[PDB]
Amino acid sequence: MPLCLKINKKHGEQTRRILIENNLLNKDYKITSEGNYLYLPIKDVDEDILKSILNIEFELVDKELEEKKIIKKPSFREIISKKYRKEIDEGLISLSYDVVGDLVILQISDEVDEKIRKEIGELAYKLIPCKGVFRRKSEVKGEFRVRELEHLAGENRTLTIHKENGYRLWVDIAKVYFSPRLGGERARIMKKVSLNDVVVDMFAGVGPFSIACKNAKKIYAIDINPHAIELLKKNIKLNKLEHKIIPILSDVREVDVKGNRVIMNLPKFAHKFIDKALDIVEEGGVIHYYTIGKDFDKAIKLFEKKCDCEVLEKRIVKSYAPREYILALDFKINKK
RNA sequence: GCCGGGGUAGUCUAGGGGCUAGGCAGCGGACUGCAGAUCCGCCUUACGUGGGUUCAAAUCCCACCCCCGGC
Ligand SMILES: C[S@@+](CC[C@H](N)C(=O)[O-])C[C@H]1O[C@@H](n2cnc3c(N)ncnc32)[C@H](O)[C@@H]1O
Ligand SMILES: [Mg+2]
Ligand SMILES: [Mg+2]
Ligand SMILES: [Mg+2]
Ligand SMILES: [Mg+2]
Ligand SMILES: [Mg+2]
Ligand SMILES: [Mg+2]
Protein backbone atom coordinates (compact mmCIF):
# COMPACT_ATOMS: atom_id res chain seq x y z
CA MET A 1 0.00 0.00 0.00
CA PRO A 2 1.31 3.53 -0.79
CA LEU A 3 1.35 3.73 3.02
CA CYS A 4 5.14 3.77 3.23
CA LEU A 5 7.40 4.48 6.17
CA LYS A 6 9.50 7.62 5.84
CA ILE A 7 12.63 7.73 7.95
CA ASN A 8 16.03 9.35 7.49
CA LYS A 9 18.64 7.56 5.37
CA LYS A 10 20.86 6.99 8.44
CA HIS A 11 18.92 4.05 9.94
CA GLY A 12 17.72 2.74 6.58
CA GLU A 13 19.08 -0.81 6.33
CA GLN A 14 18.65 -1.49 10.06
CA THR A 15 15.03 -0.34 9.70
CA ARG A 16 14.52 -2.36 6.52
CA ARG A 17 15.67 -5.69 7.98
CA ILE A 18 13.04 -5.07 10.64
CA LEU A 19 10.22 -4.33 8.19
CA ILE A 20 10.97 -7.52 6.23
CA GLU A 21 11.57 -9.52 9.37
CA ASN A 22 8.13 -8.62 10.73
CA ASN A 23 6.85 -9.35 7.22
CA LEU A 24 5.49 -5.79 6.96
CA LEU A 25 7.51 -4.79 3.87
CA ASN A 26 5.52 -4.41 0.67
CA LYS A 27 8.11 -5.85 -1.70
CA ASP A 28 6.21 -4.99 -4.88
CA TYR A 29 7.54 -1.40 -5.06
CA LYS A 30 11.04 0.07 -4.96
CA ILE A 31 12.69 1.84 -2.06
CA THR A 32 13.49 5.51 -2.75
CA SER A 33 15.42 8.48 -1.34
CA GLU A 34 14.94 12.26 -1.64
CA GLY A 35 17.80 14.12 0.02
CA ASN A 36 18.45 12.72 3.50
CA TYR A 37 15.15 10.86 3.77
CA LEU A 38 14.42 7.20 3.06
CA TYR A 39 11.03 6.04 1.78
CA LEU A 40 10.41 2.36 2.57
CA PRO A 41 7.12 1.08 1.23
CA ILE A 42 5.47 -0.81 4.09
CA LYS A 43 2.26 -2.90 3.98
CA ASP A 44 -0.19 -1.32 6.43
CA VAL A 45 -0.96 -1.10 10.16
CA ASP A 46 -1.51 1.90 12.44
CA GLU A 47 1.81 3.51 13.23
CA ASP A 48 1.02 2.52 16.81
CA ILE A 49 2.39 -1.00 16.41
CA LEU A 50 5.00 0.43 14.05
CA LYS A 51 5.91 2.96 16.72
CA SER A 52 6.60 -0.09 18.85
CA ILE A 53 8.37 -2.61 16.60
CA LEU A 54 11.15 -0.02 16.34
CA ASN A 55 12.35 2.92 18.42
CA ILE A 56 13.40 5.59 15.93
CA GLU A 57 10.85 8.26 14.98
CA PHE A 58 9.41 8.54 11.48
CA GLU A 59 6.19 9.28 9.66
CA LEU A 60 3.72 7.66 7.29
CA VAL A 61 3.82 9.39 3.93
CA ASP A 62 1.52 7.94 1.29
CA LYS A 63 3.19 8.26 -2.12
CA GLU A 64 2.42 7.22 -5.73
CA LEU A 65 3.62 4.18 -7.72
CA GLU A 66 7.33 3.95 -8.62
CA GLU A 67 6.78 0.46 -10.10
CA LYS A 68 9.06 -2.54 -9.60
CA LYS A 69 10.55 -4.59 -12.43
CA ILE A 70 9.77 -8.29 -12.42
CA ILE A 71 12.90 -10.02 -11.11
CA LYS A 72 12.93 -13.67 -12.16
CA LYS A 73 11.15 -15.40 -15.01
CA PRO A 74 9.13 -18.45 -14.00
CA SER A 75 10.49 -21.99 -14.47
CA PHE A 76 9.98 -24.32 -17.46
CA ARG A 77 8.76 -26.91 -14.96
CA GLU A 78 6.69 -24.25 -13.26
CA ILE A 79 4.90 -23.31 -16.45
CA ILE A 80 4.46 -26.50 -18.45
CA SER A 81 2.68 -28.08 -15.46
CA LYS A 82 0.16 -25.19 -15.37
CA LYS A 83 -0.36 -24.92 -19.11
CA TYR A 84 -0.18 -28.63 -19.99
CA ARG A 85 -1.40 -30.34 -16.82
CA LYS A 86 -3.55 -32.77 -18.82
CA GLU A 87 -0.72 -34.20 -20.94
CA ILE A 88 1.52 -34.30 -17.90
CA ASP A 89 -1.06 -36.36 -16.08
CA GLU A 90 -0.90 -38.52 -19.20
CA GLY A 91 2.88 -38.82 -19.08
CA LEU A 92 3.13 -37.25 -22.55
CA ILE A 93 5.56 -34.41 -21.66
CA SER A 94 8.60 -34.31 -19.39
CA LEU A 95 9.21 -31.52 -16.90
CA SER A 96 12.80 -32.64 -17.12
CA TYR A 97 15.21 -31.82 -19.91
CA ASP A 98 18.94 -31.73 -20.18
CA VAL A 99 21.27 -29.08 -21.63
CA VAL A 100 24.29 -29.96 -23.68
CA GLY A 101 26.33 -26.82 -24.16
CA ASP A 102 23.79 -24.17 -25.16
CA LEU A 103 21.21 -26.51 -26.66
CA VAL A 104 18.30 -28.07 -24.82
CA ILE A 105 16.62 -31.39 -25.32
CA LEU A 106 13.07 -32.09 -24.14
CA GLN A 107 10.93 -35.21 -24.05
CA ILE A 108 7.55 -34.89 -25.71
CA SER A 109 5.42 -37.84 -26.81
CA ASP A 110 4.45 -38.51 -30.42
CA GLU A 111 0.74 -37.98 -29.62
CA VAL A 112 1.34 -34.32 -28.92
CA ASP A 113 0.43 -32.49 -32.12
CA GLU A 114 3.31 -31.14 -34.16
CA LYS A 115 1.96 -27.65 -33.56
CA ILE A 116 2.02 -27.92 -29.79
CA ARG A 117 5.50 -29.47 -29.61
CA LYS A 118 6.71 -26.28 -31.26
CA GLU A 119 4.74 -24.19 -28.81
CA ILE A 120 6.46 -26.10 -25.99
CA GLY A 121 9.86 -25.82 -27.66
CA GLU A 122 9.15 -22.15 -28.20
CA LEU A 123 8.20 -21.96 -24.55
CA ALA A 124 11.43 -23.54 -23.40
CA TYR A 125 13.42 -21.34 -25.75
CA LYS A 126 11.83 -18.43 -23.98
CA LEU A 127 12.17 -19.79 -20.45
CA ILE A 128 15.67 -21.39 -20.47
CA PRO A 129 19.15 -19.93 -21.12
CA CYS A 130 19.78 -21.46 -24.52
CA LYS A 131 19.96 -20.87 -28.25
CA GLY A 132 18.16 -23.97 -29.46
CA VAL A 133 15.55 -26.52 -28.41
CA PHE A 134 15.20 -30.09 -29.58
CA ARG A 135 13.26 -33.22 -28.69
CA ARG A 136 14.36 -36.84 -28.22
CA LYS A 137 12.97 -38.84 -31.18
CA SER A 138 14.28 -42.36 -30.33
CA GLU A 139 16.24 -44.31 -27.78
CA VAL A 140 20.02 -44.60 -27.95
CA LYS A 141 20.34 -46.69 -31.10
CA GLY A 142 23.25 -49.11 -31.11
CA GLU A 143 26.65 -48.93 -32.77
CA PHE A 144 27.78 -45.32 -32.36
CA ARG A 145 25.18 -44.93 -29.61
CA VAL A 146 23.43 -42.06 -31.39
CA ARG A 147 19.93 -40.71 -30.76
CA GLU A 148 17.60 -39.26 -33.42
CA LEU A 149 16.41 -35.72 -32.66
CA GLU A 150 13.89 -33.14 -33.89
CA HIS A 151 14.29 -29.34 -33.97
CA LEU A 152 11.54 -27.35 -32.24
CA ALA A 153 12.81 -23.83 -31.75
CA GLY A 154 15.81 -21.53 -32.04
CA GLU A 155 19.04 -22.14 -33.95
CA ASN A 156 18.89 -25.42 -35.92
CA ARG A 157 22.54 -26.42 -35.39
CA THR A 158 23.49 -29.54 -33.37
CA LEU A 159 27.07 -28.39 -32.63
CA THR A 160 28.01 -26.63 -29.37
CA ILE A 161 30.54 -26.32 -26.53
CA HIS A 162 29.68 -27.90 -23.17
CA LYS A 163 31.80 -26.84 -20.15
CA GLU A 164 32.16 -29.25 -17.20
CA ASN A 165 34.58 -29.75 -14.30
CA GLY A 166 37.06 -27.06 -15.36
CA TYR A 167 37.30 -28.14 -19.02
CA ARG A 168 35.39 -27.40 -22.23
CA LEU A 169 34.30 -29.91 -24.94
CA TRP A 170 32.95 -29.83 -28.53
CA VAL A 171 29.82 -31.94 -28.90
CA ASP A 172 27.44 -32.83 -31.72
CA ILE A 173 24.22 -34.05 -30.19
CA ALA A 174 23.23 -35.45 -33.60
CA LYS A 175 26.00 -37.91 -34.59
CA VAL A 176 27.76 -38.66 -31.27
CA TYR A 177 26.71 -39.82 -27.80
CA PHE A 178 27.23 -37.44 -24.89
CA SER A 179 25.53 -37.02 -21.54
CA PRO A 180 25.80 -33.79 -19.57
CA ARG A 181 24.51 -35.71 -16.55
CA LEU A 182 27.64 -37.84 -16.30
CA GLY A 183 29.88 -35.02 -15.09
CA GLY A 184 29.55 -36.30 -11.55
CA GLU A 185 30.85 -39.66 -12.67
CA ARG A 186 33.79 -37.94 -14.37
CA ALA A 187 34.63 -35.99 -11.20
CA ARG A 188 34.61 -39.38 -9.41
CA ILE A 189 37.15 -40.73 -11.91
CA MET A 190 39.08 -37.44 -11.87
CA LYS A 191 40.09 -38.01 -8.25
CA LYS A 192 41.06 -41.68 -8.65
CA VAL A 193 43.59 -41.03 -11.46
CA SER A 194 47.32 -40.78 -10.62
CA LEU A 195 50.34 -38.88 -11.92
CA ASN A 196 51.83 -42.21 -13.02
CA ASP A 197 48.78 -43.96 -14.50
CA VAL A 198 48.49 -44.80 -18.22
CA VAL A 199 44.78 -44.61 -19.17
CA VAL A 200 43.02 -46.49 -21.95
CA ASP A 201 39.56 -45.06 -22.68
CA MET A 202 38.15 -47.99 -24.71
CA PHE A 203 35.09 -46.13 -26.05
CA ALA A 204 35.99 -42.44 -25.74
CA GLY A 205 33.25 -40.72 -27.74
CA VAL A 206 34.31 -37.05 -27.89
CA GLY A 207 36.66 -37.49 -24.93
CA PRO A 208 34.90 -36.37 -21.76
CA PHE A 209 36.46 -39.23 -19.73
CA SER A 210 39.88 -38.84 -21.33
CA ILE A 211 40.20 -35.12 -20.67
CA ALA A 212 38.85 -35.82 -17.18
CA CYS A 213 41.99 -37.90 -16.53
CA LYS A 214 44.41 -35.05 -17.37
CA ASN A 215 46.52 -35.95 -14.31
CA ALA A 216 47.99 -39.06 -15.95
CA LYS A 217 51.16 -39.71 -17.97
CA LYS A 218 49.72 -40.88 -21.35
CA ILE A 219 46.10 -41.47 -22.40
CA TYR A 220 44.71 -43.51 -25.27
CA ALA A 221 41.29 -42.50 -26.60
CA ILE A 222 39.73 -45.14 -28.77
CA ASP A 223 36.50 -44.93 -30.72
CA ILE A 224 35.02 -46.54 -33.83
CA ASN A 225 32.85 -43.55 -34.70
CA PRO A 226 34.59 -41.34 -37.31
CA HIS A 227 32.50 -38.38 -36.24
CA ALA A 228 33.63 -38.96 -32.65
CA ILE A 229 37.38 -38.71 -33.33
CA GLU A 230 37.02 -35.41 -35.21
CA LEU A 231 35.54 -33.70 -32.14
CA LEU A 232 37.96 -35.68 -29.92
CA LYS A 233 40.96 -34.26 -31.75
CA LYS A 234 39.49 -30.76 -31.46
CA ASN A 235 38.80 -31.49 -27.81
CA ILE A 236 42.43 -32.47 -27.28
CA LYS A 237 43.86 -29.25 -28.77
CA LEU A 238 41.22 -27.06 -27.14
CA ASN A 239 42.37 -28.36 -23.75
CA LYS A 240 46.14 -28.27 -24.32
CA LEU A 241 46.71 -32.02 -24.04
CA GLU A 242 48.22 -32.92 -27.44
CA HIS A 243 51.39 -34.60 -26.18
CA LYS A 244 49.27 -36.50 -23.69
CA ILE A 245 46.08 -37.82 -25.23
CA ILE A 246 46.48 -40.03 -28.28
CA PRO A 247 43.31 -40.45 -30.39
CA ILE A 248 42.89 -43.64 -32.39
CA LEU A 249 40.20 -44.49 -34.90
CA SER A 250 39.32 -48.17 -34.59
CA ASP A 251 37.47 -51.09 -33.13
CA VAL A 252 39.00 -51.16 -29.66
CA ARG A 253 39.40 -54.93 -30.11
CA GLU A 254 41.94 -54.28 -32.87
CA VAL A 255 44.02 -51.96 -30.70
CA ASP A 256 47.22 -53.24 -29.18
CA VAL A 257 47.59 -50.95 -26.18
CA LYS A 258 48.38 -51.56 -22.59
CA GLY A 259 47.56 -49.56 -19.50
CA ASN A 260 46.84 -49.73 -15.78
CA ARG A 261 43.60 -47.74 -15.86
CA VAL A 262 40.96 -48.76 -18.40
CA ILE A 263 37.58 -47.13 -18.78
CA MET A 264 34.64 -49.04 -20.23
CA ASN A 265 31.97 -46.49 -20.91
CA LEU A 266 29.57 -48.73 -22.90
CA PRO A 267 26.82 -49.71 -20.41
CA LYS A 268 24.97 -52.22 -22.59
CA PHE A 269 27.68 -54.06 -24.47
CA ALA A 270 30.42 -53.57 -21.91
CA HIS A 271 29.98 -57.22 -20.97
CA LYS A 272 31.05 -58.18 -24.51
CA PHE A 273 34.45 -56.54 -23.98
CA ILE A 274 35.71 -57.83 -20.64
CA ASP A 275 38.18 -60.05 -22.56
CA LYS A 276 39.71 -57.08 -24.33
CA ALA A 277 39.82 -54.98 -21.22
CA LEU A 278 41.76 -57.64 -19.26
CA ASP A 279 44.05 -58.10 -22.25
CA ILE A 280 44.65 -54.37 -22.04
CA VAL A 281 45.10 -53.73 -18.32
CA GLU A 282 48.48 -54.36 -16.65
CA GLU A 283 48.48 -56.51 -13.52
CA GLY A 284 47.75 -54.57 -10.37
CA GLY A 285 45.83 -52.20 -12.62
CA VAL A 286 42.17 -51.20 -12.26
CA ILE A 287 39.17 -51.42 -14.62
CA HIS A 288 36.35 -48.88 -14.43
CA TYR A 289 33.39 -50.91 -15.56
CA TYR A 290 29.88 -49.69 -16.32
CA THR A 291 26.82 -51.83 -16.85
CA ILE A 292 23.06 -52.12 -16.52
CA GLY A 293 21.35 -54.23 -13.90
CA LYS A 294 19.37 -54.42 -10.70
CA ASP A 295 22.32 -55.45 -8.52
CA PHE A 296 26.12 -55.81 -8.64
CA ASP A 297 26.11 -59.58 -8.19
CA LYS A 298 26.03 -60.35 -11.92
CA ALA A 299 28.94 -58.12 -12.88
CA ILE A 300 31.07 -59.30 -9.98
CA LYS A 301 30.37 -62.88 -11.15
CA LEU A 302 31.62 -62.22 -14.71
CA PHE A 303 34.88 -60.65 -13.70
CA GLU A 304 35.63 -63.23 -11.03
CA LYS A 305 34.98 -66.13 -13.40
CA LYS A 306 37.84 -64.59 -15.44
CA CYS A 307 40.63 -63.36 -13.12
CA ASP A 308 41.60 -62.83 -9.49
CA CYS A 309 40.15 -59.41 -8.89
CA GLU A 310 39.13 -57.14 -6.04
CA VAL A 311 36.17 -54.77 -6.13
CA LEU A 312 37.59 -51.42 -5.10
CA GLU A 313 34.28 -49.56 -5.24
CA LYS A 314 30.85 -50.20 -6.68
CA ARG A 315 28.08 -47.65 -6.97
CA ILE A 316 24.83 -46.73 -8.69
CA VAL A 317 25.37 -44.09 -11.39
CA LYS A 318 21.79 -43.31 -12.47
CA SER A 319 18.38 -44.85 -13.11
CA TYR A 320 18.34 -46.57 -16.49
CA ALA A 321 14.77 -47.71 -16.78
CA PRO A 322 11.81 -48.62 -14.63
CA ARG A 323 13.52 -50.60 -11.86
CA GLU A 324 16.84 -50.91 -13.76
CA TYR A 325 20.10 -48.99 -13.12
CA ILE A 326 23.45 -48.17 -14.70
CA LEU A 327 26.10 -49.53 -12.42
CA ALA A 328 29.74 -48.68 -11.98
CA LEU A 329 32.32 -51.09 -10.57
CA ASP A 330 36.03 -50.46 -10.16
CA PHE A 331 37.87 -53.77 -10.32
CA LYS A 332 41.54 -54.16 -9.29
CA ILE A 333 42.99 -56.73 -11.67
CA ASN A 334 45.83 -58.62 -10.03
CA LYS A 335 46.95 -61.69 -12.00
CA LYS A 336 45.36 -62.65 -15.36
C1' G B 1 50.54 -4.66 -23.95
C1' C B 2 45.84 -2.33 -24.80
C1' C B 3 39.56 -2.97 -25.51
C1' G B 4 35.86 -5.44 -24.38
C1' G B 5 32.45 -9.71 -21.72
C1' G B 6 33.43 -12.29 -17.63
C1' G B 7 35.17 -15.48 -12.47
C1' U B 8 27.92 -17.32 -9.25
C1' A B 9 27.28 -22.88 -3.70
C1' G B 10 30.23 -29.65 -5.93
C1' U B 11 29.41 -28.12 -11.18
C1' C B 12 27.23 -25.22 -14.91
C1' U B 13 24.45 -21.27 -16.28
C1' A B 14 20.77 -16.39 -15.65
C1' G B 15 20.45 -11.97 -13.33
C1' G B 16 23.03 -7.19 -12.03
C1' G B 17 22.46 -1.21 -5.46
C1' G B 18 18.10 -3.18 -0.55
C1' C B 19 14.20 -9.16 -3.37
C1' U B 20 17.86 -15.13 -2.33
C1' A B 21 18.66 -17.68 -8.43
C1' G B 22 17.23 -22.00 -12.54
C1' G B 23 19.50 -26.61 -13.86
C1' C B 24 22.38 -30.93 -13.42
C1' A B 25 25.16 -33.81 -9.85
C1' G B 26 24.22 -35.55 -4.44
C1' C B 27 20.71 -37.87 -0.70
C1' G B 28 15.78 -40.52 0.14
C1' G B 29 11.69 -42.74 -1.94
C1' A B 30 8.66 -44.51 -6.43
C1' C B 31 7.93 -46.95 -11.18
C1' U B 32 8.20 -55.02 -12.10
C1' G B 33 10.39 -53.63 -16.57
C1' C B 34 12.60 -53.02 -25.20
C1' A B 35 13.57 -46.30 -21.88
C1' G B 36 21.70 -43.96 -21.13
C1' A B 37 14.44 -42.76 -18.57
C1' U B 38 10.43 -40.54 -15.95
C1' C B 39 7.81 -39.38 -11.28
C1' C B 40 7.41 -37.32 -5.89
C1' G B 41 10.58 -35.29 -1.26
C1' C B 42 15.09 -32.84 0.46
C1' C B 43 19.45 -29.93 -0.54
C1' U B 44 15.47 -23.03 2.39
C1' U B 45 20.94 -16.66 0.73
C1' A B 46 26.15 -18.38 -3.73
C1' C B 47 28.78 -14.02 -6.92
C1' G B 48 37.73 -13.92 -7.65
C1' U B 49 41.27 -10.98 -4.17
C1' G B 50 42.29 -6.19 -1.61
C1' G B 51 40.49 -1.58 -0.59
C1' G B 52 36.66 2.40 -1.57
C1' U B 53 31.64 5.31 -2.29
C1' U B 54 26.61 4.31 0.44
C1' C B 55 22.25 3.92 5.96
C1' A B 56 22.68 -0.56 2.08
C1' A B 57 27.34 -3.86 -2.70
C1' A B 58 27.49 -10.10 -5.97
C1' U B 59 25.96 -5.48 -8.52
C1' C B 60 28.81 0.87 -8.53
C1' C B 61 34.59 2.82 -8.13
C1' C B 62 39.81 1.81 -8.37
C1' A B 63 43.51 -1.78 -8.17
C1' C B 64 45.34 -6.70 -8.81
C1' C B 65 45.07 -11.86 -10.14
C1' C B 66 43.13 -15.62 -13.77
C1' C B 67 39.47 -16.97 -18.02
C1' C B 68 37.27 -15.90 -22.77
C1' G B 69 37.40 -13.65 -27.38
C1' G B 70 39.60 -8.66 -30.41
C1' C B 71 43.83 -5.30 -32.37
C1 LIG C 1 28.82 -44.29 -24.59
S1 LIG C 1 29.69 -43.61 -26.05
C2 LIG C 1 31.08 -42.75 -25.21
C3 LIG C 1 30.43 -41.56 -24.45
C4 LIG C 1 31.38 -40.62 -23.65
N1 LIG C 1 32.17 -41.35 -22.63
C5 LIG C 1 30.49 -39.58 -22.95
O1 LIG C 1 29.82 -39.87 -21.96
O2 LIG C 1 30.42 -38.46 -23.38
C6 LIG C 1 30.27 -45.09 -26.86
C7 LIG C 1 31.33 -44.84 -27.88
O3 LIG C 1 31.93 -46.11 -28.10
C8 LIG C 1 32.19 -46.26 -29.50
N2 LIG C 1 32.26 -47.68 -29.84
C9 LIG C 1 31.23 -48.56 -30.07
N3 LIG C 1 31.71 -49.75 -30.34
C10 LIG C 1 33.06 -49.70 -30.30
C11 LIG C 1 34.10 -50.63 -30.49
N4 LIG C 1 33.82 -51.93 -30.80
N5 LIG C 1 35.38 -50.21 -30.36
C12 LIG C 1 35.69 -48.94 -30.06
N6 LIG C 1 34.74 -48.03 -29.88
C13 LIG C 1 33.43 -48.36 -29.98
C14 LIG C 1 31.06 -45.50 -30.18
O4 LIG C 1 31.47 -44.96 -31.42
C15 LIG C 1 30.74 -44.38 -29.18
O5 LIG C 1 31.32 -43.13 -29.56
MG1 LIG D 1 27.35 -14.90 -16.51
MG1 LIG E 1 22.04 -25.13 -7.02
MG1 LIG F 1 18.12 -41.42 -5.79
MG1 LIG G 1 30.95 -10.63 -11.53
MG1 LIG H 1 35.09 -6.73 -8.67
MG1 LIG I 1 23.02 -7.46 0.03
Side-chain angles (χ1 to χ4, degrees):
Chain A
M1 318 292 257
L3 166 39
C4 57
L5 199 60
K6 176 178 164 178
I7 53 178
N8 181 294
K9 291 182 57 179
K10 175 186 296 297
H11 13 58
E13 188 60 52
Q14 199 172 60
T15 290
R16 201 212 76 227
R17 297 159 72 169
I18 296 174
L19 286 180
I20 165 183
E21 193 173 349
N22 291 288
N23 218 301
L24 261 294
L25 172 67
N26 166 332
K27 48 179 299 179
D28 281 321
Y29 299 91
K30 230 314 184 303
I31 281 185
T32 39
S33 58
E34 166 231 13
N36 304 300
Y37 291 159
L38 240 196
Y39 294 48
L40 294 67
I42 182 182
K43 280 175 163 62
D44 169 59
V45 271
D46 55 57
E47 67 182 75
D48 299 305
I49 63 172
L50 279 176
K51 270 184 173 300
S52 57
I53 39 179
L54 47 67
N55 41 79
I56 71 170
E57 78 300 62
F58 53 90
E59 198 204 305
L60 296 184
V61 189
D62 316 306
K63 192 164 305 306
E64 276 203 354
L65 72 327
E66 37 282 352
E67 47 185 292
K68 176 53 195 174
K69 183 96 158 300
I70 189 62
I71 57 298
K72 187 63 168 194
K73 298 231 175 191
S75 276
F76 174 78
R77 165 186 283 283
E78 252 175 353
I79 272 197
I80 299 312
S81 58
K82 275 40 260 184
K83 188 171 212 301
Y84 301 108
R85 175 155 296 317
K86 190 229 293 175
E87 23 274 291
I88 268 178
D89 277 2
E90 301 194 55
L92 306 185
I93 302 182
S94 184
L95 297 176
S96 284
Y97 63 82
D98 54 14
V99 294
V100 176
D102 75 332
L103 309 209
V104 317
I105 309 151
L106 323 189
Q107 284 198 65
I108 312 173
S109 185
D110 275 331
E111 281 67 298
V112 179
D113 319 68
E114 43 282 59
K115 190 49 217 158
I116 299 184
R117 306 184 214 167
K118 316 283 186 184
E119 310 302 63
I120 294 166
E122 268 304 329
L123 191 48
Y125 180 176
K126 199 164 302 77
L127 283 167
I128 300 174
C130 73
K131 207 97 46 178
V133 172
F134 287 77
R135 173 182 85 81
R136 279 168 150 75
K137 194 61 172 300
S138 81
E139 59 159 289
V140 175
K141 281 190 287 200
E143 197 178 60
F144 296 23
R145 307 309 301 161
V146 163
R147 182 201 285 285
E148 313 191 301
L149 279 40
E150 180 190 74
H151 189 61
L152 304 167
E155 204 164 353
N156 186 181
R157 67 168 188 199
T158 80
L159 206 307
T160 189
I161 296 195
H162 189 66
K163 308 188 185 184
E164 71 176 56
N165 309 308
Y167 53 82
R168 289 222 245 48
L169 293 156
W170 286 95
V171 172
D172 180 302
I173 74 175
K175 292 157 294 184
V176 318
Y177 175 80
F178 178 74
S179 185
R181 299 190 189 175
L182 284 158
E185 187 55 30
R186 278 152 217 140
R188 242 273 309 298
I189 254 55
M190 184 135 58
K191 304 190 193 315
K192 327 232 75 181
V193 181
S194 316
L195 274 279
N196 199 59
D197 289 342
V198 171
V199 188
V200 159
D201 183 355
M202 285 169 82
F203 313 118
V206 308
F209 271 83
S210 290
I211 309 294
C213 296
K214 65 178 305 176
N215 279 170
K217 171 169 59 177
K218 217 195 317 298
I219 293 171
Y220 296 106
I222 313 178
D223 203 295
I224 196 180
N225 172 191
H227 297 72
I229 298 302
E230 282 179 40
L231 286 277
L232 185 42
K233 294 172 172 174
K234 295 183 68 180
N235 286 317
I236 300 180
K237 105 276 179 287
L238 160 53
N239 296 283
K240 298 162 183 177
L241 302 160
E242 314 81 49
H243 300 79
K244 173 155 287 176
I245 296 182
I246 294 178
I248 299 191
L249 166 66
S250 164
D251 163 358
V252 69
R253 289 150 177 282
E254 323 268 61
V255 182
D256 64 300
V257 273
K258 217 91 178 197
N260 56 178
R261 187 169 312 274
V262 185
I263 304 159
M264 291 183 86
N265 186 24
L266 190 59
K268 190 177 297 188
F269 310 99
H271 58 189
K272 277 180 290 184
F273 291 85
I274 300 185
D275 284 339
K276 184 56 184 163
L278 293 168
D279 176 56
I280 296 179
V281 81
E282 310 270 40
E283 274 169 346
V286 25
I287 291 183
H288 297 296
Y289 183 89
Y290 293 75
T291 177
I292 301 182
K294 306 192 181 196
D295 58 56
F296 303 106
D297 302 324
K298 168 60 176 311
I300 298 174
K301 241 128 60 188
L302 277 181
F303 273 79
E304 294 198 305
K305 287 171 63 76
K306 298 186 134 295
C307 62
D308 177 32
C309 68
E310 179 197 345
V311 180
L312 295 189
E313 167 166 51
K314 68 175 174 292
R315 84 188 201 73
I316 289 178
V317 184
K318 84 211 293 183
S319 183
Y320 174 84
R323 209 146 254 151
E324 288 166 55
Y325 304 103
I326 278 175
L327 303 168
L329 294 79
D330 293 12
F331 294 99
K332 176 184 184 196
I333 305 301
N334 36 41
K335 176 169 294 183
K336 249 114 67 185

